[PDB]
Design a protein around this ligand. Structure first.
Ligand SMILES: O=C(O)Cn1ncc2ncnc(NCCc3cnc(NC(=O)Nc4cccc(Cl)c4)s3)c21
Length: 245
């Protein structure tokens, strides 16, 4: 694989480590995405080895709710990822467009994360970076989890033990709240305020969040990590079963 193999389209997203572009294989016509990472930024942040970890992890993961990495290669000062293209964009963009999600879309996305994270954990992978800007939408509106850079084998999304696998469960409950409310639950003006609220698990619901949702989120956002609700318990949760497509 080399740059020569691809036609590049429009920018899909700007990241701090690199840019995403829509692309087409020249000798397959197949549509895909291409993420350019500059070594400059990788070595100055000391994440070079992490990228090699992501690459090996994404060599083992096949699930309809996980974005595929078909392959990778490097130039002289750039590393390239060849990714499944997600036509309908990020969940983050959609949340900005809609301002908040209804119960049905929220429960459906939460079901799709949980199936996906359940598959990861069964393969001994913890994602650790669950957040709206790393959730993508396929052709049929399907949630796809992307970006396995911080995977192992803002501060708003970190569980208190970060300020094993139960971190994904805290992140999941942060997501569910953010999906319904349009703001993550420990949002504050100062960094110190935000830290204090996370450690204390100090959040409140606006009146429009229903009892079923409050229960789900409360069983997820617990200081004691091992007492958080499991992925199987999330999929079997009454509010999820009632609202999920
Ligand atoms: O997301 C958008 O805003 C735009 N977008 N829109 C459609 C779309 N379809 C597919 N992919 C997109 N974006 C790339 C998603 C990633 C998948 N895998 C990644 N891996 C990674 O970032 N690794 C990584 C990063 C930094 C450091 C290190 Cl060490 C490793 S990123 C798309």
């Amino acid at each position: 694989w080399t740059l020569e193999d691809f036609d590049i389209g429009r920018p899909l997203g700007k990241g701090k480590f690199g840019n995403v572009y829509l692309a087409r294989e020249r000798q397959s016509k197949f549509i895909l995405a291409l993420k350019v990472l500059f070594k400059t930024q990788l070595e100055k942040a000391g994440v070079e080895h992490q990228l090699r970890r992501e690459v090996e992890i994404q060599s083992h993961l096949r699930h309809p709710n996980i974005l595929r990495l078909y392959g990778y290669f490097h130039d002289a000062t750039r590393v390239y990822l060849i990714l499944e293209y997600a036509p309908l964009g990020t969940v983050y963009r959609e949340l900005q467009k809609l301002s908040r999600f209804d119960e049905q879309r929220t429960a459906t996305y939460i079901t799709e994360l949980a199936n996906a994270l359940s598959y990861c954990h069964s393969k001994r992978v913890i994602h650790r970076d669950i957040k709206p800007e790393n959730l993508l939408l396929g052709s049929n509106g399907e949630l796809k989890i992307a970006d396995f850079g911080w995977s192992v084998h803002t501060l708003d999304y970190l569980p208190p033990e970060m300020i094993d696998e139960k971190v994904d469960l805290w992140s999941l409950g942060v997501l569910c709240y953010e999906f319904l409310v349009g703001m993550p639950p420990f949002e504050a003006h100062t960094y110190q305020e935000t830290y204090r609220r996370i450690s204390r698990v100090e959040f409140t619901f606006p009146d429009f969040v229903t009892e079923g949702a409050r229960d789900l989120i409360s069983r997820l956002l617990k200081h004691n990590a091992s007492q958080r609700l499991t992925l199987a318990e999330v999929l079997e949760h009454p509010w999820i079963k009632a609202n999920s497509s």
